[PDB]
Amino acid sequence: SLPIIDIAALAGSDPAARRSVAVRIDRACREQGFFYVVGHGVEAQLVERLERLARQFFALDETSKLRWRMELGGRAWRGYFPLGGELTSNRPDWKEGLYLGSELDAEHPEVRAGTPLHGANLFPEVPGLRETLLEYLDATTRVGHRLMEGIALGLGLEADYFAARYTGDPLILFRLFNYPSQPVPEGLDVQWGVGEHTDYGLLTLLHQDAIGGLQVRTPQGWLEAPPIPGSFVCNLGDMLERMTGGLYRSTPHRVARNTSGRDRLSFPLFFDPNFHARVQPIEGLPEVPEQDDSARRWDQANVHAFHGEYGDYLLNKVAKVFPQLRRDL
Ligand code: NA
């Protein structure tokens, strides 16, 4: 019941084919804030290899995986994180993972400047994994650029609206998440619905394996977003919602508890503004009713969003959980 949008025309230059995609993106963004993307051109064989090599990584013993743990990754925000210890019933979003981002070397200007969230990945010693990760990052980054063109066209803007201001050199945050299967809770599930959240930035592009469990809170009710082979799942973040004045939705979502007996793999890619972008409200959009209160409380809780640089807005969300990001020396 989520829209399935073919975005192939966004790689081309046909104004009418691009307009048709933009019209669908606009409707999906206004009404659900979530849609599937097909015709995106990311090779099916690359996606399968990524899933298999990710699976191979998480099947390593924990002592091995900890060789690449985030505690070794520094301010770039990278590496492996293990499962929480056991509770009577763990959270439905109980997981391990691998934090990744753009591969930047020691001579990159942001690395020499010491800017948080820039630097090198920790690459586990799984044959093929490093190259596969970099190729997938490259290919899905291009999908992100094209989707922003469709979003710009949908809003009545020039297709390069975001590229020219904020995403020409975007902040790319990529994660491999693995959710092990859990016992079905005994009695009533205290943990039900836990983990509901919205994303922080512009665009999320999700690859999910065949297990599924993604659930989306649309204005018309909670819906399942099952895996569809050949698709990514796309949703918008808080920054995009707020810079459109609430016209395009940042929609809450969560994952159901995996009790399927097989580990569930989910790979989100966050396509965000440059760290130093100074994001501003988009001009020329219709006013959306009932947003002054929400708009003002969000501004107060996210001062850097419209009064500073995007990276400080994002660090304000995550620095408390990752003290290495603002660590000096
Ligand atoms: Na998320």
TrEMBL record:
Domain Fe2OG dioxygenase: from-to ranges: 169-273
| Recorded superkingdom | Bacteria
Which is a Pfam family this sequence falls into? 2OG-FeII_Oxy
What reaction(s) does this enzyme catalyze? 2-oxoglutarate + O2 + 2 H(+) = ethene + 3 CO2 + H2O; L-arginine + 2-oxoglutarate + O2 = guanidine + L-glutamate 5-semialdehyde + succinate + CO2
Listed EC numbers: 1.13.12.19, 1.14.20.7
Obligatory cofactor(s) = Fe(2+)
Major enzyme class:
oxidoreductase
Molecular functions per Gene Ontology: 2-oxoglutarate oxygenase/decarboxylase (ethylene-forming) activity; 2-oxoglutarate-dependent dioxygenase activity; metal ion binding
Its keywords, alphabetically, are: Ethylene biosynthesis, Iron, Metal-binding, Oxidoreductase
Name its GO BP terms in alphabetical order. ethylene biosynthetic process
Gene3D superfamilies named among the record's database cross-references: B-lactam Antibiotic, Isopenicillin N Synthase, Chain
Q: In which pathway does it act?
A: Alkene biosynthesis; ethylene biosynthesis via 2-oxoglutarate
Record's keyword annotation contains Metal-binding? yes
Subunit notes for this chain? Monomer.
The family this protein is said to belong to? Belongs to the iron/ascorbate-dependent oxidoreductase family.
- Name assigned to this protein: 2-oxoglutarate-dependent ethylene/succinate-forming enzyme
